[PDB]
Ligand binder design. Structure first.
Ligand SMILES: *[C@@H]1O[C@H](CO)[C@@H](O)[C@H](O)[C@H]1NC(C)=O
Ligand SMILES: *[C@@H]1O[C@H](CO)[C@@H](O)[C@H](O)[C@H]1NC(C)=O
Ligand SMILES: *[C@@H]1O[C@H](CO)[C@@H](O)[C@H](O)[C@H]1NC(C)=O
Lengths: 447, 447, 447
């Protein structure tokens, strides 16, 4: 893992390079079945406590079954509808007549089986729980008589253990309108997930990747409820396919860059916009503005292209030349010089203004650097914490090399009188045009 | 269900009509009691494992009881205080002396009972768990001797099952400062909720509505902890009363509308503001800006007026004439032409700019539409996915009719030199006044 | 508890005073160990149901152990890395050879013990669960033979109870990448937390404070996973140290202040910015802009300085003189006069504009106050609810004294023609300078 960082003194921004990205570009759906028992209440003369315990657990089984039924009778729309059409397409096929009977026959003797549906896909189905065999074989002879037979206490415990997975799956599907993410161990055990990864149409290097990051895989997966019909509970798990592997990725960090005059009210500020994760993707750059869309593990990043923006690759030139014409680099302006700090991958940017006490300390040496007014940076080599005012941040102690790219702060190139200080989604060149417009009103009204 | 949609080419916005709204306007509180056992530790000479299991579960019962006590001794304020005064008013009455004794007497023989409190309301109380009868009858003869009696293994399992609901209710009330939402199956089982709906002072059509959408009802309900006193645990469930039923509701979708010049830096943008859910409400329009405030089920919408804004009904004319003087329609401006798409109820708005590759595909036919630069729309009829750059969205496959309302994009009516490009919460007429002000500075400085 | 409030009619803002703050300034780490059993599968000829139940629970024990191992083999970075360096420093020491053996020896006979690590700290270690003794003593004689011995049903239940805490701790550490907050009862029981508070190097008054607010303490704590190695599961709990106790704190509430002309489009608005919690802190003021960073219990506030801004104490003069030169008080401007209300600690600010029906009611008297157009305030004395349009808010019924500070609304001091209506993070003096600039263009172009 070659993680490196670059602080640009001129724009008060840093870029953390060297990350290998795995971008989600496709979906792999799989059908998960639970064999249920079509057992209407069959209540008999019962008294001894083992029978009461069985009848109680049996009512919890019926309530979970009717709840999954009212969940499929009326399914509320979810904010995930734009990401689940593939798994939903499998559920719509399962609703066809005879289709639940097909998977019901293929999984008659085995747990796993490939099934060609009436919509063509050769989908892979599994069978993680068998309640029809247990209730109809171990319980009906106990409840299908004039008076109930006495089950042994081992059966009471075994039925509470088996029925448990059904109750938790019904709880998640009910509170989330049939669509859950991340995918829990109740929907798919770690053992079942690794077996599903092994059976995926991916390279052996991708199976090793998803198997070594199962929690991230779970967080980028969906579990979709299909149907309860004819003693079968089926639901689709939608797993990520990372069509982009090992693509270069980097993270942009930005902090306010103000002037440091001694008279308050005479200072102007500037901040680069669009901080977050950038990855090379198909001749363009995929930008992820939201913080939860990229999970990081050491050297590696796992992003979902669902919540990304597609930018031309020239967007990276804002990191090397912000005044560069191939790309209109974006900034925001204000006159709000409040001190702050940003913890980067290998150090910390500190924007210190006013009377704020900014410093960087080592746990055993004490304060090793005092920041003056302006925007500065310190590496994690020898630094443990950074204090800005009354706030103390912890520096990431990850190994890597930092580079301080010295340069004049670009905020000094601007005349304060004509500066646009109210700008939000503004470009470097847009700001220069507003300055030419305020300068033309004085050029004409001097001549 | 008559769901229809209208895309306005002129403003790059769409309106999804035909939804029937159910707006929350009132609250129905109900008291939920759990009979507890005032049993101080009564530890005796115990050794056999059944006694250990009982004593362990009994300590978990005392810790849950003392935790509910420290929860009512000091109750942290919650961000829900502006929505729970009705249920809280019932809890303040329960704290009166003799009032817990009243409900304790009315529920002596039955589970449900109406109780007239010392604040007048005829409230409906229930009794979902009876631990006083079970501990004092089944457990004290086992622990109230010199040496403990041996309980059978059926009692150990039955006590872990009954004590379980207490522990989960105490967990939710403890982590949430006594106020939980949504209302879980631990606070109120699906069986108890449907019975509470049946006993509500609502029409039979509203009971069928809440009973068919119990999860949405749960998400729009509160469970408030009252008091633990004199062998009684009481808490109030605050359920929604939908005074507005079947009111017309619609959803506004907006997307950036920019000019498409070939020289970057010469383009101006405009976006309609206030996207979200609108419902007719009491001679006005209730607007819901936040995304989680309206749950949708097929044709129907369930909103809470707690987080809504009240607008004049003329706000709908921004959908028919945005240049119309009865209402100052709102826009935001910029020069940020980044491509994007919005998945609507029956199609997709696509704002394509620059070199971005925007398209709409069918699963079996491939690309069926390529968007050019500007703002456009495509219906879900025959369309499965929409790609903008490296991002792929899924189109909602819901049945309904779309209408493409052709019209000149209003961004073309604006001169770029005098356009206000930094506007956030700006009106159509506000922007026109800023244009008259920049045009007067050139009219006077030409004459 | 002396809670008081002050409404400033001139700026449409209120300040709730009298709160005693407890600001987190340090961390107290403690090591929590669980003795595990290094037991490879030792599967034997087993058939009777008690053996099946044991073997099932034993596989759930191994899966939880391997999951904690893959969690420590690859630990994903978390957004909490800037707040956990202290507890992480203890985990890095535990990874040293012989260091897990040290705590393994000190806790050989007792549950609690102070341990001097190979990094100096005298840390306090505990031992909350002993699975090595239970599996190796109660289970291996049952599974380490040619054919498995029959365990009694008491052992099956006791092992499911003991193994349970391991499975829930592994679930939380797995889904959260080894760092959880708040700290659950699974990580640390209420009994263990109070005992940890008693053993803390704090005054007796701080132990009473944290013990009376354990849920807030839990919400401001972290549980960090260390290592699984040599039959020991260790994880660090990072508890808050409140170096600031009983410091004066107050909460600023702001609401839009517009003009009330009868011709729409001629009104200008202004809103004070930086609403939230303020606390005196080390010669400065700690401001908390985010809503979840301060938990309130009656009179008291518990904040974390991690997400605060440090402001000069002159920031309070925006509450007494907003036109005052020692501090540049901040405002935002617009022309968006939409009615709204803010529920304060002791009353409600109501900003009423247009045709909106704003009122304040008592539950038994009905409407007791009708607001006219402008910004106004009403105390909670005699008031239960406040209605703005179709929205009804509940007034906090907390006891305290309100003071209505009468004054001319400052929005009336501004000429509408030259007002800057697009301002976001703007100062009072910044706005005055933009007004001098628009007035100079007319002074020179009249002369
Ligand atoms: C003003 O416009 C000219 C175009 O001739 C350009 O070269 C110059 O950079 C502009 N001024 C500023 C301050 O950007
Ligand atoms: C300028 O003001 C006049 C008022 O006489 C108005 O009719 C016109 O629409 C305004 N101009 C623009 C571009 O809105
Ligand atoms: C204009 O500038 C002068 C400085 O001489 C200042 O005193 C005055 O307050 C400014 N005007 C406004 C409206 O703030």
């Amino acid at each position: 893992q070659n993680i490196t960082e670059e602080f640009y003194q001129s724009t008060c921004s840093a870029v953390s390079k060297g990350y290998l990205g795995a971008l989600r570009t496709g979906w792999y759906t799989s059908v998960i079945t639970i064999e249920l028992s079509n057992i209407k209440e069959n209540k008999c003369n019962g008294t001894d406590a083992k029978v009461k315990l069985i009848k109680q657990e049996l009512d919890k089984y019926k309530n979970a079954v009717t709840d999954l039924q009212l969940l499929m009778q009326s399914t509320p729309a979810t904010g995930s509808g734009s990401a689940i059409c593939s798994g939903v397409a499998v559920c719509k096929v399962l609703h066809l007549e005879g289709e639940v009977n097909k998977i019901k026959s293929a999984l008659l003797s085995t747990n796993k089986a490939v099934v060609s549906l009436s919509n063509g896909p050769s989908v892979l189905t599994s069978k993680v729980l068998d309640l029809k065999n247990y209730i109809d074989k171990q319980l009906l002879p106990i409840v299908n008589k004039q008076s109930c037979s006495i089950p042994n206490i081992e059966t009471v415990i075994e039925f509470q253990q088996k029925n448990n997975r059904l109750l938790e799956i019904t709880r998640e599907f009910s509170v989330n309108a049939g669509v859950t993410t991340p995918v829990s161990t109740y929907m798919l055990t770690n053992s079942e997930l690794l077996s599903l990864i092994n059976d995926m149409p991916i390279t052996n290097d991708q199976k090793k990747l998803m198997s070594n990051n199962v929690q991230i895989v779970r967080q980028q997966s969906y579990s979709i409820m299909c149907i309860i019909k004819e003693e079968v509970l089926a639901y689709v798990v939608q797993l990520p396919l990372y069509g982009v592997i090992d693509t270069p990725c980097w993270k942009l960090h930005t902090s306010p860059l103000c002037t440091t005059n001694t008279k308050e009210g005479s200072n102007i500020c500037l901040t680069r916009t669009d901080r977050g994760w950038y990855c090379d993707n198909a001749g363009s750059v995929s930008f992820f503005p939201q913080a939860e869309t990229c999970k990081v593990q050491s050297n590696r990043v796992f992003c979902d292209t669902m919540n990304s923006l597609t930018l031309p690759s020239e967007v990276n030139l804002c990191n090397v030349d912000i005044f560069n014409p191939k790309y209109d680099c974006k900034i925001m302006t204000s006159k709000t010089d409040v001190s702050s700090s940003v913890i980067t991958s290998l150090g910390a940017i500190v924007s210190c203004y006013g009377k704020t006490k900014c410093t960087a300390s080592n746990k055993n040496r004490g304060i090793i650097k005092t920041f003056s007014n302006g925007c500065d940076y310190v590496s994690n080599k020898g630094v443990d914490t950074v204090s800005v005012g009354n706030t103390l941040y912890c520096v990431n102690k990850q190994e890597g090399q930092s580079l301080y790219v010295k340069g004049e702060p670009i905020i000094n190139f601007y005349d304060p009188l004509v500066f646009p200080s109210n700008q939000f989604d503004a470009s470097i060149s847009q700001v220069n045009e507003k300055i030419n417009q305020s300068l033309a009103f004085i050029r004409k009204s001097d001549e």
